[PDB]
UniProtKB/TrEMBL annotation, chains A, B:
Name assigned to this protein: Transcriptional regulator, TetR family protein
Record flagged with keyword Repressor: yes
Boundaries of every HTH tetR-type domain copy: 9-69
Keywords of this entry: DNA-binding, Repressor, Transcription, Transcription regulation
Classification via InterPro entries: BetI_C, Homeodomain-like_sf, HTH-type_TetR-like_transc_reg, HTH_TetR, Tet_transcr_reg_TetR-rel_C_sf
GO molecular function, one term: transcription cis-regulatory region binding
Xref: PROSITE patterns: HTH_TETR_2 (PS50977)
Source taxon at top rank: Bacteria
Statement: the UniProt record of this protein carries the keyword Hydrolase: no
Segment forming the signal sequence: none
Length: 194, 194
């Protein structure tokens, strides 16, 4: 049958699927294992079987939202190229709706943790680089199509990526000034300037 | 009376000044009040008279770095207006040197806690709003001086602020792609496109 390692991974993924919104909504500090156990439909003992503590569940929550974002991008892209593809990707990454604001809350919480840890950092650098790579393809396409000028693709990718990572913070913390509509306008005006 | 209150506030400021680098360097999770006490030259008993816990010291650490940044801006501005003034502010906010990378780590730790704490949220909003206000003045000045096109000041402020907040995360987490040089290049190319 399935190796125990794979089985335990599956269970962690299932528990995370059920718990990540609670962590996003309450924050990792207010979140506690007993409430997560309740919400995932597990006993306390069973939950401890799969997770060392809430820190590990924060890590897997970040894996969850990273994978979910990636899947939305892959499903939305179709045959898009250039700026059409870039807008599609950006709309999945930016916190432009309530589900994506919950994702932003998980990311914002994981980041300072990743600053002091390798395992916690690993899934992050890969996620960021995967997006950089796609963004660079799309921006080079735009450059060759003439939908943007003779841009410095590496620097433009970094500008946009940094802007969208800032949105995870400010879209949550200053939602008047960094509303969904404002985020979309910031993207449009940015690409217009290229 | 008043002298006692002033003494109390001065001591909190001194402890904060003595603690913030420790908090940036090890992170708020690994930091504890015993270690903060030792770096400030206090006993734990004595420290409990000024601070209730490490989260309050994180908040005052953020205020400390915000005040420090504002001082750097004020001093460096001189007679600068418009795009020149904007560049000066941005160089103090972005994590383009080692000390500013420490400041970035304070911000990154406070943000997710502010997402679940009214006082920390308020502290962050004050800093973000101060910078939005300054940046808007400079960009209006640029428009009035005829050094930019017909820019949407509100949106451009938001673009640049979000970009700079993302840098606080990526400057630490992806220091190759978000190096000091690349941050400066991001700023220059952004301003050039206005």
């Amino acid at each position: 049958g399935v190796p125990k390692l794979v089985d335990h991974d599956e269970r962690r993924r299932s528990i995370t699927a059920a718990a990540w919104r609670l962590i996003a909504a309450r924050g990792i500090e207010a979140a506690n294992m007993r409430d997560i156990a309740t919400e995932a439909g597990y006993t306390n003992g069973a939950l401890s079987h799969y997770f060392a503590g809430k820190d590990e569940i924060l890590r897997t929550s970040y894996e969850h939202i990273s994978e979910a974002t990636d899947r939305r991008i892959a499903e939305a892209l179709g045959d898009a190229t250039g700026l059409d593809a870039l807008r599609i990707l950006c709309r999945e990454v930016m916190p432009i709706n309530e589900e994506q604001l919950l994702e932003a809350r998980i990311a914002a919480s994981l980041w300072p943790r990743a600053m002091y840890d390798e395992q916690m950092a690993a899934t992050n650098r890969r996620t960021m680089d995967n997006w950089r790579e796609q963004m660079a393809i799309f921006l080079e396409q735009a450059r060759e199509e003439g939908s943007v000028g003779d841009i410095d693709v590496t620097i433009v990718v970094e500008q946009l990526l940094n802007m969208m990572m800032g949105m995870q913070i400010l879209g949550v913390l200053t939602p008047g000034e960094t509303s969904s509509e404002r985020q979309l306008e910031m993207l449009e005006q940015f690409v217009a300037a290229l």
